[PDB]
């Protein structure tokens, strides 16, 4: 690989999502462990034209989670204690 | 020399006046922002010591220096790579155009990827790219440059094709004209505005595209 | 790993607590790495230069320690600015930001406290079950175009209706959800259709 | 002059007067060996991390 | 010798981490700005005004970078302004009629209706205007017809 050499994990020729990163655009997963180039998502072609539109007839409400830290643990510490007890 | 601040203009103010554009013009603004760092590794021991033994058994006495500096070093890494992907990697769809370029006379071939390059980028993109000049190790990025243009591709793609849809859900096609109508009624202006003067705005974006790629290309 | 977030700044404050506690045993080059077997091995001339040696080896430590701190206290410090920043403009309400509160349409937010942290519920509006449709930018009508108020042009196939953006409710075109600018001889792509009065 | 490396050929034009070569970090990266007056190039031994 | 070169090179090495966390934080920052502005300015239309250029925002390109992003940032900018003589509501019938959505003009003989970013005179009528009140109350209104379609 460009990152380097890779010992133990056998190349495949078929993408997947990244689930180790190698680096250099190569990932490796267990399935043995395989190595291969990520792939950055599924192909969709818009059926793109200039006299058609698509319009939603139904909707989904869909709740999702975001986790954000706010506090970190309050510590002090005495520095002539830590240095000199 | 005393710095000016700026042109002095004095606001025609009076209490039953007012000013109403007649015209409009499309501009189009760069602005850049950088999103990762060069990956740099440093071997504590090897940086300190090289290959030197005594030293490394001397260097034993102070402790566990070169376990925070490689992990610090090693966060900041990775840190780069979680950064790419908040940026560029927002879809997980890989939206294509369609092989006709009619968009109502709006030209993107500037933004779009050249498919004669083999990089596969835009003209402004591989403009941008050329524009751009012991222990130590350089990890290279988990997403390569026509990865990162794929996605930039992709992001290309459907805001084209879909406008905001894409972004929120399913991509829904839409012609571009319409889009670019919906888009101004989102700043206050009505569609007729828009489709009476759809050649003149359509030249507009070009152009502003194309002094947008000169003025890349004309200043270091 | 739901909340690996906040386990990971758990584990770097415990383990940078554990790295500085873990720095005095080391002498750094002195005889020992404990005072209290100096000063009763040695006279004070030397153990000047030893107590020396673990002093600088400590303070060391200790400055490498509150640097870190520091720096991982600006990063915590910017999340809750933006966790302060979600919790007014999510909860408090409905932001037209786009993926700043979830992905979708966002409608509202729900705020859960957490150790060390929060979790937002963002309860999003995403559209499904598209279905395609012939579009047209305008109506010509008695040679007048007409423009949607509110929604957009849409053709099952032989009629022409008017509908909102977002969601499929076609109704007929009528004088009520349209206005009239120009005649029919400018706007690119308009279709002839009858336009209703009431 | 104590080091660890790969000797190797080099197409260096050392000047007459000159003997050794030093990188930025002043390690010599080339050597003039005695004897034979042959220029060898010193390259560092392969490393990574792992 | 060797213990004053180890405590020499530790203390560049720490040195040099402490920068390179310091710019790892300002890049983190810029790239959560740029995650930001991908998100806002190219996916959707942003009505936060200079965050996605100058001027009304309509739409946003990405370019990638050489270790950055660049966003081509289209926007709309009011041209050829022009002067009117405005007025904030219209008496008629006794009744104060105020814009929907637009604005009242007048080019010096005759009072017309406009959206507030361009210039498009419209004839005052009951279908873009909406009545609050009489005329007694309104500072600055001035005496016009309303048609009736
Ligand atoms: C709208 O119509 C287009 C074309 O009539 C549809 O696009 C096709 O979808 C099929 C089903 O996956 C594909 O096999 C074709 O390759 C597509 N063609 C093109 C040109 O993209 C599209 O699916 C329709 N939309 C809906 C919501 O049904
Ligand atoms: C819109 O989608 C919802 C689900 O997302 C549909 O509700 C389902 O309808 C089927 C058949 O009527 C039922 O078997 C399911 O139990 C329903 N699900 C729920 C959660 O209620 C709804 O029918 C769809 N509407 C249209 C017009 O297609
Ligand atoms: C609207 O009218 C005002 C005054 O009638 C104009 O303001 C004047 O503009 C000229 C040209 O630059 C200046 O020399 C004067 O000093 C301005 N007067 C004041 C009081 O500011 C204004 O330019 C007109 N607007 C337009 C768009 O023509
Ligand atoms: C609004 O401005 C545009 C330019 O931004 C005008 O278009 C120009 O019109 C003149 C004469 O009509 C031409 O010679 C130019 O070549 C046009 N320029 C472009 C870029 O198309 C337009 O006429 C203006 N409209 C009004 C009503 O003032
Ligand atoms: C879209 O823009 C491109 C470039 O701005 C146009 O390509 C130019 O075409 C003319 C005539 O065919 C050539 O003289 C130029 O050299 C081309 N420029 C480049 C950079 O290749 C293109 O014609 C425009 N229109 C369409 C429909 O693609
Ligand atoms: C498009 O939609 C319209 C309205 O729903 C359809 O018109 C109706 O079709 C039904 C089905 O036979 C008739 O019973 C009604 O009398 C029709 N209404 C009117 C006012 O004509 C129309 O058929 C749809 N077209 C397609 C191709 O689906
Ligand atoms: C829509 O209707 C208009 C008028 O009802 C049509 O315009 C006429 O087109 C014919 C043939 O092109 C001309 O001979 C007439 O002089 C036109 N009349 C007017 C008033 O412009 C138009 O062709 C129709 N379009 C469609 C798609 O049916
Ligand atoms: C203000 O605008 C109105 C409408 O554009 C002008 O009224 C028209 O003026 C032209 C030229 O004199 C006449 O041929 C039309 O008959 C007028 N229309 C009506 C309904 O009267 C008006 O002249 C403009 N006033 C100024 C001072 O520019
Ligand atoms: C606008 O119209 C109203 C009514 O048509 C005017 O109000 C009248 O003004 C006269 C003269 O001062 C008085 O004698 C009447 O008693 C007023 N009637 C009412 C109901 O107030 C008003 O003066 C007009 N304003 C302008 C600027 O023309
Ligand atoms: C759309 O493209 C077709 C050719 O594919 C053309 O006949 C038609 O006039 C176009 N319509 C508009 C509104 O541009
Ligand atoms: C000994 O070294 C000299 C240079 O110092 C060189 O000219 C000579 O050829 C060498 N002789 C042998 C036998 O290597
Ligand atoms: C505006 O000011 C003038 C005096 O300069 C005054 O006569 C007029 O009534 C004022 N109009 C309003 C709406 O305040």
């Given at each position: 690989?460009?990152?380097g ?81 | ?36 760092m060069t990956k740099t590794s440093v071997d504590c021991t090897m940086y300190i010591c090289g290959d030197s033994?005594?030293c490394s058994?001397?260097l ?5 220096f070169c376990?925070?500096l490689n992990?610090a070093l090693?966060?900041i890494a990775?840190?780069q ?51 751009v000049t012991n222990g130590l190790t350089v990890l290279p990025p ?79 | ?198 | 002059l104590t080091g660890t490396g790969v000797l190797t050929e080099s197409n260096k034009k050392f000047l007459p007067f000159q003997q050794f070569g030093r990188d930025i970090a002043d390690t010599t990266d080339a050597v003039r060996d005695?004897?034979?007056?042959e220029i060898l190039d010193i390259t560092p031994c392969s490393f990574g991390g792992?």
């Amino acid at each position: 690989t460009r990152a380097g050499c890779l010992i133990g994990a056998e190349h495949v020729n078929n993408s997947y999502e990244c689930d180790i990163p190698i680096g250099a655009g190569i990932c490796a997963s267990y399935q043995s462990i395989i190595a291969y180039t990520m792939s950055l998502g599924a192909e969709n072609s818009v059926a793109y034209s200039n006299n058609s539109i698509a319009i939603p007839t139904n909707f989904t409400i869909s709740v999702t989670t975001e986790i954000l830290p706010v506090s970190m643990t309050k510590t002090s510490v005495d520095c002539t204690m830590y240095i000199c007890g | 020399y005393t710095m000016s601040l700026g042109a002095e203009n004095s606001v025609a103010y009076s209490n039953n006046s007012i000013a109403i554009p007649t015209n409009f013009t499309i501009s189009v603004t760069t602005e850049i922002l950088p999103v990762s760092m060069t990956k740099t590794s440093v071997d504590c021991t090897m940086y300190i010591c090289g290959d030197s033994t005594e030293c490394s058994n001397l260097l034993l006495q102070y402790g566990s220096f070169c376990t925070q500096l490689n992990r610090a070093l090693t966060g900041i890494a990775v840190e780069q790579d979680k950064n790419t992907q908040e940026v560029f990697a927002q879809v997980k769809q890989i939206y294509k155009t369609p092989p006709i370029k009619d968009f109502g006379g709006f030209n993107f071939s500037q933004i779009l990827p050249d498919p004669s390059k083999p990089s596969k980028r835009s003209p402004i993109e591989d403009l941008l790219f050329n524009k751009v000049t012991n222990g130590l190790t350089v990890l290279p990025p988990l997403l390569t440059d026509e990865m990162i243009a794929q996605y930039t591709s992709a992001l290309l793609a459907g805001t084209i094709t879909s406008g905001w849809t894409f972004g929120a859900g399913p991509a829904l096609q839409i012609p571009f004209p319409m889009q670019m109508a919906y888009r101004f009624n989102g700043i206050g202006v009505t569609q007729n505005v828009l489709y009476e003067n759809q050649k003149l705005i359509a030249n507009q974006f070009n152009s502003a595209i194309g002094k947008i790629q000169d003025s890349l290309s004309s200043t270091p | 790993s739901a909340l690996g977030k906040l386990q990971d700044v758990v584990n770097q404050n415990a383990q940078a607590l554990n790295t500085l506690v873990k720095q005095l045993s080391s002498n750094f080059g002195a005889i020992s790495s404990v005072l209290n077997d100096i000063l009763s091995r040695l006279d004070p001339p030397e153990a000047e230069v030893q107590i020396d040696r673990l002093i600088t080896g400590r303070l060391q430590s200790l400055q490498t320690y509150v640097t870190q701190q520091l720096i991982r206290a600006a990063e915590i410090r910017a999340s809750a600015n933006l966790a302060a920043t979600k919790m007014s403009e999510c909860v408090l309400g409905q932001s037209k930001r786009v993926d700043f509160c979830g992905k979708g349409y966002h409608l509202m937010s729900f705020p859960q406290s957490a150790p060390h942290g929060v979790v937002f519920l963002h309860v999003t509006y995403v559209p499904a079950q598209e279905k395609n449709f012939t579009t047209a930018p305008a109506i010509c009508h008695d040679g007048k175009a007409h423009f949607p108020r509110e929604g957009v042009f849409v053709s099952n196939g032989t009629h022409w209706f008017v509908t909102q953006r977002n969601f499929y409710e076609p109704q007929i075109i009528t004088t009520d959800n349209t206005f009239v600018s120009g005649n029919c001889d400018v706007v690119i792509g308009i279709v002839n259709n009858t336009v209703y009065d009431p | 002059l104590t080091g660890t490396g790969v000797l190797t050929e080099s197409n260096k034009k050392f000047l007459p007067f000159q003997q050794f070569g030093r990188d930025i970090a002043d390690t010599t990266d080339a050597v003039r060996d005695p004897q034979t007056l042959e220029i060898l190039d010193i390259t560092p031994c392969s490393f990574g991390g792992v």
